[PDB]
Every structure is written in structure tokens, then in C-alpha cells.
Prior knowledge:
Number of helices of chain B: 5
Distance between the termini of chain A: 49 Å
Subcellular location (chain B): Virion; Host nucleus
Subcellular location (chain A): Host nucleus; Virion
Oligomer: part of a larger assembly
Strand content of chain A: under 5%
Organism (chain A): Human adenovirus F serotype 41 (HAdV-41)
Protein name (chain A): Hexon protein
Radius of gyration of chain A: 20 Å
Structural class of chain A: little secondary structure
Strand content of chain B: 15-25%
Family (chain A): Belongs to the adenoviridae hexon protein family.
Shape of chain B: elongated
Largest sheet of chain B: 4 strands, antiparallel
Number of strands of chain B: 26
Number of helices of chain A: 0
Amino acid sequence: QAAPNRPNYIGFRDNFIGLMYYNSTGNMGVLAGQASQLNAVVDLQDRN
Amino acid sequence: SIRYSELAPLYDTTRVYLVDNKSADIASLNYQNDHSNFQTTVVQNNDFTPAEAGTQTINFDERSRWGADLKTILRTNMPNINEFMSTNKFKARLMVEKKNKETGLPRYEWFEFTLPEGNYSETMTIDLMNNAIVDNYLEVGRQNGVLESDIGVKFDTRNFRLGWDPVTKLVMPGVYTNEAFHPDIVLLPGCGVDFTQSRLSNLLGIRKRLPFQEGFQIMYEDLEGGNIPALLDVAKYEASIVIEPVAKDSKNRSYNLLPNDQNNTAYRSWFLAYNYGDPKKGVQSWTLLTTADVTCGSQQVYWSLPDMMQDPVTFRPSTQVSNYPVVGVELLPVHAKSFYNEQAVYSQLIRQSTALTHVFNRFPENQILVRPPAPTITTVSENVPALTDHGTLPLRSSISGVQRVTITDARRRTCPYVHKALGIVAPKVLSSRTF
Amino acid sequence: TSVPISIPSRNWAAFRGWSFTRLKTKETPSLGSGFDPYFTYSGSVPYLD
Amino acid sequence: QKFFAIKNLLLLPGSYTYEWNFRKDVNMILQSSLGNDLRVDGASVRFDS
Amino acid sequence: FEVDPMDEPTLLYVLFEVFDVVRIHQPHRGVIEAVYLRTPFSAG
Lengths: 48, 435, 49, 49, 44
């Protein structure tokens, strides 16, 4: 006597959060100039 | 002023330490990062339990342009034969079959070979090639109708002129000499080898006179006049006192004689053509003879720090690991040590007497295909820790608390054989950013 | 039951306040690395959404 | 783009290098109605351009 | 704190509301410079 298997929607996450991975210093991109040599974007580890 | 948030503003050459073994406290930052490319926290402040102290930056002064005094140590346990520096990816063509072709001449095919990855001496690695070059004749070649005395490529360390009397052009005691001069190749013409894909030519010493010109394959038609001679039949010369070249050996194994009456063999050799042919047009004009040199040449490592250092000139500060700005080019700490002996040709018989194995010595009666003798100058590659200096080079002002160290090889990827990385950075004042 | 936890002694210069809540260790990634083993669980982490 | 210093910004002109690292962790890019184990089943995100 | 009993190993999530300010400006064409602040856990 077979009963139906259980559903599982597989979306993305809410507002795609994580597809950009922020909040980890090291492997995070920059917003610098072409030659500014100091990025305007670093972040600290405990800030989500 | 060298400012920090928690402590008082200290002065004028502090010292920041970029260690590796501290990283086990930050057990979440570097999982897929190797031991060379890692991340550590600079601060080493036991008050803050430095899982949380990875954010407290070390703010240098912004009024005077700083400058570091870089020092580092590096000890890398790296095997002499690896899969990383491409010591076991070469091509060596062989004479596969000659039975069922019905075209006369046999068929050839380029075979890619591998080596069991470890750390081996030069007396063994050349004789470990005979675990690679046999296992695609013992696997593929023997099953398709070709005799055992027709194996194309065998590396060798011996000479074939030591009894060559030009009265006769044979070897008068009837045995080839057992000393090891240089590692050359011993070949059947038609099925050459390759080293352009590999770095294994650095191991032997059979490299190229004009090294940059792309494509280096010592094909087996370029060796002209370097025919290995035959044997004077000392079993019949001494039993008659007439001159006979030895055609077949003692187990129905023949050589390759051009006709049977010529006192040369079709088996050629590189060292027999490098120094016993024409010195202007031969292989001597586009190859050269070098040292034994088991180390294969140390490819330099690029010591790099992405965020500690304002970059050297013409470097992008990008985050790609193959584009980090190099802040120092130190030597690879793999170091050559030449251990000499004299009994090593007889120690071959000693190392055979403790095993009773012909496993490592196939074909003991074919005098060409004898196991190549041990050189008297053996070389091994140990690994000395190198405390080195990289002078003085500029500094990013606000150094982050977490910090990446990256060691990068000549192929511009991270080394997997670095297993003790340690950088020491000491700031100082270079110039004045304000007037 | 208890969490005998205390911050290291340092400046508290004019902040706004605490905000404490909870989550499961299985249901929360290790984001400090570039990639995450020990994170078999998948879906609607309390740490982000 | 959710990062606060580049959420809003008024770019006065120039050429700006804009490095970025994306995520291919299929384990935590796909929310589930179940909270199962992804990446052991065989889901795989890929990136064309 | 002291909390209830559970089943899973859990983590005690604290969200200190502690002033994050960025002060960016550009004096040139392609020279952008960021100044940060967070004032405990200081960084600049």
C-alpha cells in the first residue's frame, strides 16, 4: 500500500544571500581604483 | 608612531610575526587553504582569545611612509620524484608489434609513462625507469609477437669504448666495461623519447645546448656514428690461440647486427655519439653534457604577502592566487648532497645477495640490457631550512588583523610540499608622506 | 544550561545594546573558510535569513 | 550588492577595478523545504557567464 | 545566561549593536579611499 513521497521545494535562498559570499576576510573581492592599490572594501570577520 | 587600539601607541620598529601553527585557533578561516597558502592572525594577543581578535587592525602611521625589514625561514620536505614538478609525465615511443602488420616494417606508438612517486637516488631512479619502460613491453609488447631482445629504449650509465681497438673495432676481453660514467640512453633506432612535456631531462643530464627553442625530443635518427660496437668472441678467441663478433648471447638473445659481418651493432647510444662522432654537426651541437644532478634544479619559490606589503612595481594587487604580488624570491630549500663511494658497483651485487631476486634486474645475460651500474658519485636531495633575507620593501598602512601568507612556485601555483612557513616582518620609517 | 562567557576587557565607547538569540550548530555554516565541510545540513539557516 | 560601503555610493568617474569571488557551494545556495543533505545527492550549480 | 535543555549542540548568538561607519571619498580619478570604524572591535 504505497503512500506519496514527501515534497521538497528547492529554491535559491531569500534575496540570493550567500551567492555573493561576504563576511570572510580572505577570498573577498575589491572595489578599488584602476591604480588606487588600497581597496575601499575589506570587512571584518564577525560582521554578517 | 605604531598605533594599536588596545595598547598604548608604541614607536619606531615594532615586530609583527606571521607564524603558521597559530592557525589552529582560527579553526574556521582556512579549510581548503593548504599549508603554504594559509591565513593567520598577526596580533597574537592572549587577552582577547584571538578567534575574536582577528579584526583588530594594526594601524601604522599615515603621515610617514613606512617600510618593512622582511625575514623568513622555510623548510620544505619535497620528494625528488613527484607528480607536481612533472617528473613522471614524459613520452617514450616503442616498437609495439611486428608480427600481424603485413607491411614489412613494425608499428610505433608514443606511450606516456608514469613513475611510483617517492624520493629516490640517481643510482636507483634510472634503474626505476626500467620499472616503467618494461611495464609497457611486459604488458603490451610481448603479447603481440616481438622478441625480448628488441626492447627499444633503455637508460644506461656505462661506456662502450674501453676496449675498442681500431685494429679490430671490437672489445678484446669480450665483456663491456662495468663502470658508470654518465647516464645516457641506449636505443634501437626508430622509436625515440621525449622530455619537452617533462622535467626529467634535468635528472639525467642529456639536456639541450640551445635550451629555449621549443620542442626537445632526442629522436633516434639524430644519433649518427654513435653505434655501440659488438663483442670480440673471447669464448672463441681464447679457445683458438679467429675474430668473430658475438651475434647471439647465452639464452638465444641476439643483438641487432647490420649485416652479421660488420663489427657495429644497431643499438646506439647518446654518450657514444656525443663524444665519438662529429663535434660540429652531431648531437653535440644541440645537446650538452652536464652533472649527475639528481635534484633536477631547484625551481624558485615566490614568497608573497597580499595585504602586509604595498606592492613592488608593476604588480596588480588582485585577489587571484596566481597573481599575488611577490615580495621576495627565495631559493627552493631542496639541497643537493653528493655522497661518494667506490663499492657501489659491487654493492649492486651486495644488494642483490640479500634478496635473491632478479625482480629489479631483468635480462642479466644480454650485455646491452644489463642493469645499469651504480655511479660512484651518488647524489641525494635533503632539505635544509633557509633563514633568508629580502631586504626592505614598503608597507600598507592599516594592516588587517587576519592575514594571508602565500608561497608560489615557478608554475605560479601554491606549493603543496611547503610544510613549515614562517615570516617575520619588521617595520621602519623610509620617508615622509607629508612635507 | 549555563554559558559562563565573558568578553575580554576592552573599550565600550557608546554602543547601542545587545541582541541575543540562538541557533543550531548543524544549521549554521562556517563562513570564514572559502568552502564548508562539516555542513551536511542544507536549507534556511537561522544565521542569515 | 549588499555590502554597506558599496550598497550606496556615488561614483565620480574613472576606471574602478572590481574583483569578485562567487560561490559554487551547492550545499548552501539552495534552500530546501526539507532541510536535507544537499551535495551528497548530486545537485550542482554551474556558471556560464 | 542559563537556558533550557535541548537535543542538538547549539550556539549562543550575540549581536552587539556597535557603530559601523564607513567614510569614503575620492580626491582623484580612480583613487578611492575608505575609512572604517567600529568602536568596540576597533578598525580603521
